[PDB]
């Protein structure tokens, strides 16, 4: 069915080694579920009706004069999305444990606002957001965003949870903060983890049970 899919990925050294495994087990099947059957080179962008994928990659504060979030424009090709998922290079990090989840979520919110101004042929669609993270959030409010500046991760994930965006978390290391954020993004009113170590909670989307 029509879907506005937004992936939010932590592009840091953590999630570096574990990303290839996560893609085969969880991310790639999730794209197929939105796009029935695996994509191969015939899928064309430009159908404004239909499922539209997008990436948001974020970083920590060690990329000091560079920007924090790299966003990609929406595509209707699942194949271009797969090439974008290959094209991420995980180079960041340093002496820290946290990352800028608030930035990635705020730009995901701006993506969903631009999607909502885009699709008017349908009032509401399946608005799905995934967060592929390996790290607890920073305590910084969001700085490099307009209309969602000065907001912590809890406020932004409340605004994700209300208005009916289906929020999911795929993490290769089981963590408390990520679980708390997932519990908070509750939509108004099954073991999918193939590996025991992986923590995967999916509010929306169907992934083969393992």
């Amino acid at each position: 069915v029509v879907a506005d899919v937004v992936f939010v990925i932590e592009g840091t050294a953590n999630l570096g080694p574990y990303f290839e495994g996560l893609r085969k087990h969880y991310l790639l099947p999730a794209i197929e579920y939105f796009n029935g059957g695996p994509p191969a080179e015939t899928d064309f962008g430009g159908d404004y009706g239909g499922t539209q994928y997008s990436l948001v990659v974020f970083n920590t504060v060690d990329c000091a004069p560079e920007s924090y979030v790299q966003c990609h424009a929406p595509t209707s090709s699942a194949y271009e999305f797969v090439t974008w998922l290959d094209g991420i290079k995980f180079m960041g990090g340093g002496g820290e444990s946290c990352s800028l989840i608030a930035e990635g979520l705020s730009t995901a919110l701006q993506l969903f606002d631009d999607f909502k101004k885009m699709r008017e042929q349908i009032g509401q669609t399946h608005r799905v957001c995934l967060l592929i993270c390996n790290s607890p959030p920073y305590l910084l409010p969001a700085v490099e965003s307009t209309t969602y500046s000065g907001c912590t991760t809890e406020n932004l994930v409340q605004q994700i949870g209300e208005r009916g965006i289906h929020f999911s978390i795929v993490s290769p290391r089981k963590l408390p903060a990520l679980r708390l954020l997932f519990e908070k993004a509750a939509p108004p009113a099954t073991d999918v983890s193939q590996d025991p170590r992986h923590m995967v909670l999916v509010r929306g989307l169907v992934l083969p049970v393992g």
Binding site: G36, G37, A40, E41, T42, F44, G45, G46, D47, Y48, G49, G50
Partner: protein, 943 residues
């Protein structure tokens, strides 16, 4: 096919649905095209269904929904172009295609409804008479047209195999004729028609289907590639060899179809086509009918005259024409008349001077006729009468017997119709032949008076009242005789009186031309007007009037075959072309041609190629029509003014011709000025450059005799130039002075297209028009600027470079005639180029005295040694010897050469590329007579 998607994304950036257009335009089928592409991609993606399924885009969902609803509708008619959209979109479906397919086929096949009668007796055809329109067939795709073609071909194959007397549907054969036009369904079309469909129709021995297909090919086929035309001529000859053709309707059809294909063989297709059938000459010739062989010889005459095949030769041996003419000498001993033989090429005259077969005397023929006449009036046993007067191999005089019978008894007994029925169609034309000789001898010996009108009335009643002979058959057998002098005048007088004394042909001609139109592709009510005519003037073919006027009236109920297109007026037309050629060949009978073109001239509205006919006629009879300007004027004005109703204003003749030369002569013939010729050649350069208004109105070249607009422009230009009353030298000089003399209306920076059009035009004209280029070259060779004054002595390899015209430094006629000579000789046939060696060694060689003239002759002739070395190798050697001779004369009659090096390099290039060592003995005499420096550089020539 997948790269079409990014193209669609480039051409179609949209946010919303694209609205559905109006279906009542054909061009709206172009509006739906990308959705039909998307359907064709979906249906291919149905194989391995989920693997690479192709969703419809958001812009094309509205058109796809319209196509879904229109396929879902089952009340579908041909009033709109929705049916075409359905065929185009779903031509790649198994069962979704049949819902429009049957919907449009059932309108043209016409099953169930009724049986509608074709003329004659015992003819009944399927019900549908209205064909598909042209814009519908043009708005399908290629695959829809291939499926429609294959469906119709299978239907005709099945109805052939059903052996049914129910004839084919009129709408079906009209639509099939309209579909064989498309050369992009070629392997399914005419190729399958002649390679597959027609041999199987001959195999099943249908004769109902075969007559329809030969009628469709005679009357509804325009652009056929020539090898198909010669293959079909071969198949017609094998058909006429077999099939026991006592059917006058089938034998008449196949004979008139072969006559329509022979005389419409184009002037340049004859040699490359007939060199393929050279080893098997019998396949393409008649063995029994003489008239088709004579028509083939006349087509050979004008084909080898128009293209000038025989100049550069004077022996018919060693050529492909000798085998054809020899195989026509066996199977047909026939001697051509002198007035006719004087018009041929040279080698054909040398061939027909020998192989002259003698013929029977007039008195011996009269005695033989009287012998069989007394034997008819004496003998009385019926079966012996029928067996004796139709003994095969006996001298055929039976129509002369009938002539003498109804000359005085004015009736025929019962037995003569039985003898005619036992004769058959094949021997009957031999009886018409000897009847034609008997007619001209008896008409010559008859005293002209009331006995003469009695003879013309009984001949008219033999044609119409008794229906013994068809009119075109009789006139063809009269016009193709071999009579000399006043006997030929009596024969053509018979033809003129037979066409013009009764009303029986003028009525049919007038009624047919006032009520019909030649544009059959634009007509959908053809069969109605066809039945109107065939009701009002029925055409009887199995001796119906003779069967009625026999005193015990014998009732014949023989079946007629399907006739959708054929009648006497459209069977007379090729015979009328041959007859007009005969009237031009003979001198003192021109007034008969004037009154014939006055009466029967409007019939040329239905000639499928009038302008090619006029081009061939004025081009081949130019030596005869040189002094009769009024007759040539009358011919071209009759043939063109027959068509002034259908075709647009200014299609053929220039308006300044229409305003001046459409006047009678008061001993002031309109002598045209240079603005006239500049206008004509401007029309040709504007058609060939491509012009959006266009000097001619644009026609449908799928249905003309000219394939592109340029060939149309060239042929009507050459017809208009040959139709003038001014002689050939003045027209040729005026065409050259368009470019040679200084002229406004001829722009600089566009001069090469004007020289190109002058090359095409003056090459396509007869001999006395393009011979004047030799005089212009001689006029510039003997100029003060090449001989005495090198006052402008600028490097001549600049001076003869015409492209100098870039800066305004073109010299004069030197570089201008060099450029126009190259433009004319570049377009010339090899028979026209082969008059260059005579012109060198006979005219130019006694006047080349200085070095500039020698270089001019080198610059003039040197680029065409490639053409000579490829096609005709005597002339390359003669030109090489002429080059060395001119070098000798300039080395003798001058003190020194300044340009010995380019001359020497040219001669080495000519040796090492073109001549080689064919010039050995005759060159060294010239080389040894040269001055020492030239000998020192030319010493390597002798090895």
């Amino acid at each position: 096919f997948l790269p079409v998607m990014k193209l669609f994304d480039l051409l179609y950036p949209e946010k919303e649905y694209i609205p559905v257009p109006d279906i009542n335009k054909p061009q709206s089928t172009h509006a739906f095209a990308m959705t039909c592409i998307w359907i064709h991609l979906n249906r291919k993606a149905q194989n391995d269904n989920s693997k690479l399924q192709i969703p419809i885009p958001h812009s094309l969902r509205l058109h796809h929904e319209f196509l879904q609803q229109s396929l879902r509708n089952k009340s579908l008619q041909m009033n709109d172009y929705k049916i075409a959209l359905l065929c185009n979109a779903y031509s790649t479906n198994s069962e979704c295609f049949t819902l429009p397919m049957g919907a449009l086929v059932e309108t043209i096949y016409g099953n169930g409804i009724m049986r509608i009668p074709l003329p004659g007796t015992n003819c009944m055809a399927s019900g549908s008479i209205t064909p598909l329109p042209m814009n519908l067939l043009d708005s399908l795709t290629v695959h829809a047209k291939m499926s429609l073609i294959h469906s119709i071909a299978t239907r005709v194959i099945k109805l052939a195999h059903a052996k049914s007397s129910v004839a084919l549907a009129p709408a079906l054969v009209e639509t099939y004729s309209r579909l064989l036009v498309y050369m992009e369904i070629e392997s399914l079309g005419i190729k399958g028609f002649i390679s597959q469909l027609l041999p199987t129709v001959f195999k099943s021995h249908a004769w109902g289907i075969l007559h329809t297909l030969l009628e469709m090919f005679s009357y509804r086929m325009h652009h056929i590639q020539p090898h198909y035309r010669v293959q079909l001529l071969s198949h017609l000859h094998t058909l006429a060899a077999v099939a026991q053709t006592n059917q006058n309707q089938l034998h008449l059809c196949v004979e008139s179809t072969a006559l329509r294909l022979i005389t419409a063989l184009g002037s340049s297709e004859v040699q490359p086509q007939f060199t393929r059938f050279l080893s098997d000459p019998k396949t393409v010739l008649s063995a029994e009918s003489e008239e088709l062989n004579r028509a083939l010889i006349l087509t050979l005459a004008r084909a080898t005259h128009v293209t000038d095949f025989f100049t550069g030769s004077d022996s018919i041996q060693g050529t492909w024409c000798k085998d054809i003419l020899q195989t026509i000498m066996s199977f047909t001993p026939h001697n051509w008349a002198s007035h006719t033989l004087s018009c041929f090429p040279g080698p054909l005259q040398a061939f027909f001077k020998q192989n002259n077969v003698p013929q029977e005397s007039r008195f011996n023929l009269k005695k033989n006729v009287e012998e069989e006449y007394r034997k008819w009036k004496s003998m009385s046993n019926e079966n012996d009468i029928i067996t004796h007067f139709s003994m095969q191999g006996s001298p055929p005089l039976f129509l002369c017997l009938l002539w003498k019978m109804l000359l005085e008894t004015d009736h025929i007994n019962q037995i003569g119709y039985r003898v005619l029925e036992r004769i058959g169609a094949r021997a009957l034309v031999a009886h018409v032949r000897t009847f034609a000789d008997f007619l001209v001898y008896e008409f010559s010996t008859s005293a002209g008076g009331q006995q003469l009108n009695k003879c013309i009335e009984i001949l008219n009643d033999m044609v119409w009242k008794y229906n013994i002979v068809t009119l075109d058959r009789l006139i063809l057998c009269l016009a193709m005789r071999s009579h000399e002098g006043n006997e030929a005048q009596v024969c053509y007088f018979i033809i003129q009186l037979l066409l013009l004394k009764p009303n029986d042909f003028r009525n049919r001609v007038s009624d047919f031309v006032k009520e019909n139109s030649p544009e059959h592709w634009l007509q959908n009510d053809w069969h109605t007007k066809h039945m109107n005519y065939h009701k009002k003037y029925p055409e009887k073919l199995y001796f119906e009037g003779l069967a009625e006027q026999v005193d015990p009236p014998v009732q014949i109920q023989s079946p007629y075959l399907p006739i959708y297109f054929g009648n006497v007026c459209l069977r007379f037309l090729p015979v009328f072309d041959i007859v007009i050629h005969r009237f031009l060949e003979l001198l003192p009978v021109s007034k008969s041609l004037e009154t014939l073109l006055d009466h029967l001239g409007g019939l040329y509205k239905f000639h499928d190629r009038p302008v090619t006919y006029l081009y061939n006629t004025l081009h081949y009879y130019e030596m005869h029509l040189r002094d009769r300007a009024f007759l040539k004027r009358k011919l071209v004005h009759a043939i063109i003014g027959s068509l002034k109703d259908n075709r647009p204003q200014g299609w053929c003749l220039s308006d300044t011709y229409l305003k001046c030369a459409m006047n009678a002569r008061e001993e002031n013939p309109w002598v045209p000025d240079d603005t006239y010729y500049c206008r004509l050649i401007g029309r040709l350069v504007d058609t060939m450059a491509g012009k959006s208004p266009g000097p001619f109105p644009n026609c449908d070249w799928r249905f003309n005799e000219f394939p592109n607009p340029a060939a149309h422009a060239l042929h009507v230009t050459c017809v208009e130039l040959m139709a003038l009353a001014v002689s050939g030298k003045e027209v040729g000089n005026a065409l050259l002075n368009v470019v040679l003399k200084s002229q406004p209306l001829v722009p600089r920076e566009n001069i090469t297209a004007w020289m190109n059009a002058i090359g095409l035009i003056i090459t396509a004209l007869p001999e006395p028009y393009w011979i004047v280029l030799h005089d212009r070259i001689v006029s510039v060779i003997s100029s003060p600027s090449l001989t005495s004054e090198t006052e402008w002595v600028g490097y001549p390899f600049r001076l003869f470079d015409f492209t100098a015209c870039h800066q305004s430094y073109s010299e004069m006629s030197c570089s201008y005639t060099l450029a126009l000579a190259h433009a004319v000789w570049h377009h010339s046939s090899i028979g026209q180029l082969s008059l260059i060696p005579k012109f060198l060694t006979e005219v130019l060689l006694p006047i080349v005295k200085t070095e500039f003239q020698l270089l001019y002759v080198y610059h003039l002739v040197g680029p065409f040694l490639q053409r000579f070395q490829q096609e005709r190798t005597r002339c390359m050697i003669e030109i090489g010897v002429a080059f060395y001779d001119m070098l000798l004369n300039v080395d003798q009659c001058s003190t020194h050469l300044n340009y010995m090096d380019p001359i020497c390099d040219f001669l080495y290039h000519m040796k090492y590329m073109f001549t080689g060592d064919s010039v050995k003995e005759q060159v060294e005499k010239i080389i040894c007579n040269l001055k020492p420096a030239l000998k020192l550089r030319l010493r390597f020539i002798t090895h």
